[PDB]
Amino acid sequence: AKSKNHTAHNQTRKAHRNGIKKPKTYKYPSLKGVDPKFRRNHKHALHGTAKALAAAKK
Amino acid sequence: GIDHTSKQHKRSGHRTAPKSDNVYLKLLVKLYTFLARRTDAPFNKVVLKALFLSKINRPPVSVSRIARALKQEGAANKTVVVVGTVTDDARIFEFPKTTVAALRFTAGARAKIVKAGGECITLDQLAVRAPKGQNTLILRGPRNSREAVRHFGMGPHKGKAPRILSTGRKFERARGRRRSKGFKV
Amino acid sequence: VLKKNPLKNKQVLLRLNPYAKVFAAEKLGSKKAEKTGTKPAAVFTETLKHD
Amino acid sequence: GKSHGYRSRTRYMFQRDFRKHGAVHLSTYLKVYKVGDIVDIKANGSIQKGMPHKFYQGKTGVVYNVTKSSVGVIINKMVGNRYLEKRLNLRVEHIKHSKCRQEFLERVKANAAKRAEAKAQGVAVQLKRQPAQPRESRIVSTEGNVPQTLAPVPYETFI
Amino acid sequence: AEQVAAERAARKAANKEKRAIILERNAAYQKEYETAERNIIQAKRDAKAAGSYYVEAQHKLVFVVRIKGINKIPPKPRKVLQLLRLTRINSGTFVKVTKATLELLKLIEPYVAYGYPSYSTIRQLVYKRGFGKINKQRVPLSDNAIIEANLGKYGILSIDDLIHEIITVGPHFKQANNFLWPFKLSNPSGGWGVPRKFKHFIQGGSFGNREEFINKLVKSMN
Amino acid sequence: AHFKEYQVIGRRLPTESVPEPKLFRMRIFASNEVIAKSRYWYFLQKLHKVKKASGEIVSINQINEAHPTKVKNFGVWVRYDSRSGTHNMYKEIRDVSRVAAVETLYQDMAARHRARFRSIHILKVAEIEKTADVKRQYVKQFLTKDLKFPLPHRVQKSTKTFSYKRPSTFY
RNA sequence: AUACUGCCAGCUGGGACUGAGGACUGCGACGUAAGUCAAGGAUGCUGGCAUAAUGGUUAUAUGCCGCCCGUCUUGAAACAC
RNA sequence: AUAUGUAAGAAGUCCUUGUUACUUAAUUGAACGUGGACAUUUGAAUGAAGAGCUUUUAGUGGGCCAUUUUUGGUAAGCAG
RNA sequence: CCUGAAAAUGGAUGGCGCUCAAGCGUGUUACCUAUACUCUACCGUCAGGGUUGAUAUGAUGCCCUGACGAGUAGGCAGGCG
Numbered sequence A: 001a002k003s004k005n006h007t008a009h010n011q012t013r014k015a016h017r018n019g020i021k022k023p024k025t026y027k028y029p030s031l032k033g034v035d036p037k038f039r040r041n042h043k044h045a046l047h048g049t050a051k052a053l054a055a056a057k058k
Numbered sequence B: 001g002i003d004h005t006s007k008q009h010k011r012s013g014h015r016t017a018p019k020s021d022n023v024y025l026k027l028l029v030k031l032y033t034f035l036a037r038r039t040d041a042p043f044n045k046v047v048l049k050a051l052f053l054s055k056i057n058r059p060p061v062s063v064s065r066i067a068r069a070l071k072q073e074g075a076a077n078k079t080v081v082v083v084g085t086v087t088d089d090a091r092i093f094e095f096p097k098t099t100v101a102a103l104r105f106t107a108g109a110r111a112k113i114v115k116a117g118g119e120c121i122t123l124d125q126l127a128v129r130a131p132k133g134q135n136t137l138i139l140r141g142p143r144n145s146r147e148a149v150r151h152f153g154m155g156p157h158k159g160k161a162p163r164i165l166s167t168g169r170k171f172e173r174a175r176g177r178r179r180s181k182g183f184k185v
Numbered sequence C: 001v002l003k004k005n006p007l008k009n010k011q012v013l014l015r016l017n018p019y020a021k022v023f024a025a026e027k028l029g030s031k032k033a034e035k036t037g038t039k040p041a042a043v044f045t046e047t048l049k050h051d
Numbered sequence D: 001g002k003s004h005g006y007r008s009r010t011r012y013m014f015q016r017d018f019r020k021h022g023a024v025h026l027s028t029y030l031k032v033y034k035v036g037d038i039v040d041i042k043a044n045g046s047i048q049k050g051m052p053h054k055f056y057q058g059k060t061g062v063v064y065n066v067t068k069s070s071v072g073v074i075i076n077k078m079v080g081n082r083y084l085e086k087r088l089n090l091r092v093e094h095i096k097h098s099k100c101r102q103e104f105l106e107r108v109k110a111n112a113a114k115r116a117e118a119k120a121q122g123v124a125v126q127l128k129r130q131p132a133q134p135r136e137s138r139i140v141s142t143e144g145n146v147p148q149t150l151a152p153v154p155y156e157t158f159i
Numbered sequence E: 001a002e003q004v005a006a007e008r009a010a011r012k013a014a015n016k017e018k019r020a021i022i023l024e025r026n027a028a029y030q031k032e033y034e035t036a037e038r039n040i041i042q043a044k045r046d047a048k049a050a051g052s053y054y055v056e057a058q059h060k061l062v063f064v065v066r067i068k069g070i071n072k073i074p075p076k077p078r079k080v081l082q083l084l085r086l087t088r089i090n091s092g093t094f095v096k097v098t099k100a101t102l103e104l105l106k107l108i109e110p111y112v113a114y115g116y117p118s119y120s121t122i123r124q125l126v127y128k129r130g131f132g133k134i135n136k137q138r139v140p141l142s143d144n145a146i147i148e149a150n151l152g153k154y155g156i157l158s159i160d161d162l163i164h165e166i167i168t169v170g171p172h173f174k175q176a177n178n179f180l181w182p183f184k185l186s187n188p189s190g191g192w193g194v195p196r197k198f199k200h201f202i203q204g205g206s207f208g209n210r211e212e213f214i215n216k217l218v219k220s221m222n
Numbered sequence F: 001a002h003f004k005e006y007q008v009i010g011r012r013l014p015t016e017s018v019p020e021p022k023l024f025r026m027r028i029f030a031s032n033e034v035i036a037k038s039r040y041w042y043f044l045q046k047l048h049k050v051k052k053a054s055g056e057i058v059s060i061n062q063i064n065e066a067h068p069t070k071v072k073n074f075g076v077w078v079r080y081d082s083r084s085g086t087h088n089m090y091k092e093i094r095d096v097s098r099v100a101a102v103e104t105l106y107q108d109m110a111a112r113h114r115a116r117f118r119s120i121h122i123l124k125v126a127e128i129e130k131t132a133d134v135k136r137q138y139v140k141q142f143l144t145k146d147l148k149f150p151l152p153h154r155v156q157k158s159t160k161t162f163s164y165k166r167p168s169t170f171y
Numbered sequence G: 001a002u003a004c005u006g007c008c009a010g011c012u013g014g015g016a017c018u019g020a021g022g023a024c025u026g027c028g029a030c031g032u033a034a035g036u037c038a039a040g041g042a043u044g045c046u047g048g049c050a051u052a053a054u055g056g057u058u059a060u061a062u063g064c065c066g067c068c069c070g071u072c073u074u075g076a077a078a079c080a081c
Numbered sequence H: 001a002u003a004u005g006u007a008a009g010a011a012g013u014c015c016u017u018g019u020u021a022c023u024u025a026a027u028u029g030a031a032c033g034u035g036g037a038c039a040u041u042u043g044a045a046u047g048a049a050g051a052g053c054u055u056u057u058a059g060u061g062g063g064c065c066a067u068u069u070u071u072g073g074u075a076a077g078c079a080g
Numbered sequence I: 001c002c003u004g005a006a007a008a009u010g011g012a013u014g015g016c017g018c019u020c021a022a023g024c025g026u027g028u029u030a031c032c033u034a035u036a037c038u039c040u041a042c043c044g045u046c047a048g049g050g051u052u053g054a055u056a057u058g059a060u061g062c063c064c065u066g067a068c069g070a071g072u073a074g075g076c077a078g079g080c081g
Helices: A011-017 A038-057 B025-036 B042-052 B063-070 B106-117 B121-128 C010-016 C018-025 C042-049 D101-118 E006-050 E073-082 E101-107 E119-129 E144-154 E158-165 E173-179 E214-221 F033-047 F096-112
Strands: B079-087 B099-103 B120-121 B135-136 B182-185 D036-041 D062-065 D069-079 D082-091 D095-096 D139-141 D148-150 E052-055 E062-068 E090-097 E112-115 E133-135 E138-140 F004-012 F024-030 F055-063 F072-081 F086-095 F118-126
Touching: B025 B042, B025 B121, B042 B079, B042 B121, B042 B135, B063 B079, B063 B106, B079 B106, B079 B121, B079 F004, B099 B106, B099 B121, B106 B120, B120 B121, C010 C018, C018 E006, C042 F004, C042 F055, D036 D069, D069 F096, D095 E101, D095 F004, D139 E006, D148 F033, E006 E052, E006 E158, E052 F055, E062 E101, E062 E119, E062 E214, E073 E101, E090 E101, E090 E173, E112 E214, E119 E158, E119 E214, E133 E144, E133 E173, E138 F072, E144 E158, E158 F086, E214 F055, F004 F033, F004 F096, F024 F033, F024 F096, F033 F055
Parallel strands: B079 B099, B079 B135, B099 B120, D148 F024
Antiparallel strands: D036 D062, D036 D095, D062 D069, D069 D082, D139 E052, E062 E090, E062 E112, E133 E138, F004 F024, F004 F055, F072 F086, F072 F118
């Protein structure tokens, strides 16, 4: 009793029912996967600039 | 006949005429449809929509959240509006003299507000005093802090609280959750 | 309640277009033109009849 | 059985080029990449480290990470009925800048210049681009250009 | 508080003033159409006299009618028809001709009959089957008031103003054409004139660019 | 349909490298103007390196028969495709206008070779007016001096189904 | 001149289907003007019957059409159950 | 050729750089920022019949046919 | 067009029949008719709206407007027993 092995028939229609809307983009994308040396310096520099901005407008 | 670009006979996707059979809630809804229709102020449209909401979409609002809202600069004398239940909070030791209009007040919340000196008001009295929602501040409780919502979107590498009854060692802390036993999620 | 179509119902026609009245009065549908007989070049007809 | 390896059916895709084999000239290493740059991906068959998968050959992405000899590229890969975020760690041999955005930056600079000139004078800048319009009326003469009559030719063997 | 006749008389006076503006605007539009037509004729005659050939300006506006039904349409032509708002058979739309528009029409040629409409057929289409889109609702024009209320921000204050913006493709052609609901036409009254429709107009069929014959087709269908 | 003859003059799109191209012309027998332009571009694509996108049409003018109520001999050189190959042929018609000569040529080729419109190129139509240049017998037959013939067996079409006398085919 | 084509907010007739709405309000036209109108949906005049006459139900006849349901199945009226 | 990635702006463009344990020979850069110049044309077309976002659950998981591309086979109302 | 051209019940351009066809090829019109298209009425569904009079009407009431309607497996809703 052989049967059908594979088909991509109807797959694109199924996808396009409620399908291929583009990815939702965000301001401030995630920093995951970034160089951790850069990430360390970014933590330190953001701390510093927050302190400076507080001093400027306390 | 027609190449339809959308689904036909599609409902609104939003509530109207709340599911509750509360006669007094229906009275409040009737009053605020009148207001939202004949006043052109966005506040009454918002309040009508919020009156339609279900219980889990009307999370309780603590008097601590009320105080944190009134701490906003220039918001000290605004009328706090909660479409839902205002609950007490014993993690705060002082409460200001605000006017809070809410659907329901717990005994503790009402007593705390009254002792602080402000007033607990129903939404119909709020409508009478501020028909256009003047000088008001709407507070909403935390919606995505339920226990049900922490199991939403569960899957590999999601970090979303498995649906479990007993918790502890030997209850899903094994193969598939640590590198010592096979893999990690 | 009921759509009355212009191009008939001269009432609806005039309601939509005040200029319909004077178009009809001055018969601008059948309007003559001034005659100035600019003569075409011989090469044009030569090319046209070129067998 | 069937074979679907990493470099499956890449026989011609990663072929170097005609008369462009051998070492890689140094401009590809002197080029610098910053986070947010748009880069086309075209794998170099000669360099086998940091090679993109054959899916990402000819795909354009955005830099999110710069390392010693590599960049991290964000790409939107179509999976099923949605787009997923993919982060490739590729080498600058396979990476190259994209001119698709650079044309747009040139246009935005020109738009700013025209905007400044408008704030000066008000001469109907018409910043917006437009598609090709239908051709306007023109007058073509026959002086020294009398039309040549053409007719279909008879059929002949030619063989 | 009485408001019996004073406000009514003021409204009547304002309406009379608006009718006056429409009257002079329509007279100017007629003068403009006539002058353009006579200048085209005179330019052709002058080029012929001078020994040249006067090339017509390529037509800036087309009318497209969907000729095929809504069954067995490939995805790309189907999407293009949906974008041109020809979602049903015999539905028509005005289209400003550019390169992008021309490629759109070329994609859906087997399913439409289009061509270069004339002032007469644009005026007849808007007068008889003119429906506007107001709050996503198809309401008959039937009044200069609704067109003024929905397009007076662009200066279009009457049905003949809208007609003029459609024919002499104006700066606000996109907005006027979008305000115009897709034209719901009947089958041609005398028939299609061909035994089979779904061949090109060149090959004895119906679909494709019947350049100026779209006027005859649409006037039969209207 | 009723064929009309058109002169169609078109050129290549003028370029700044060299403006005003050579401005070619053709005579095209077509049902209307759209088909006339289409056939012009067909034959120009066959002849020169041009297409509708790469060129433009500067003139279309339908041409009338000089004397559409006088009988002339028309030699028509055609080429056509059969089911096997391409053949050049030469026929001739007695007619009053070139348009009717071409229409009857199209009917003739359809009837005698099953050649449809698409597979026929009218190479040339030449109005020949002298005898001894008419080569076909089926034309020299009617150029006979003082020609007269009868129409035997006249069949008269009746409107009513039933007739009350036996018919006559006399003329 | 005629033909062919285009236009007319050109004119003049013969037919058919429909008459939804139910005080007014609106947009317009008419010597602008008191008022009238074909202008946000049929009124006016008249006749016969007032009863199985119309109509409903039912049985038949006639014209056209109509395979046996349920099921499993890619596919059932199936010589599948 | 047809299909295919990206871009066509306000989360944009340009400026003495404020922070840093990163980087630089180096207030060199890198990243993130304060502040500053820029709408009624905020930067092609067409459409948009609302956009986005969750939760939960049914049936299905034997398919078959047509045009075109195409494999095995002499071929098949064959198999893929 | 003819020869090439042979299969089993009697037999199928659908049939009768048709020969300057009612055949073949190609032009021109006229005409016929789908549950399609246009316009109208009515039903339902969806959507957008209007509406606080002390009055005799229960505001999921009274209204205006537009667009839609195929359906197995299946889901939900409003109802009948």
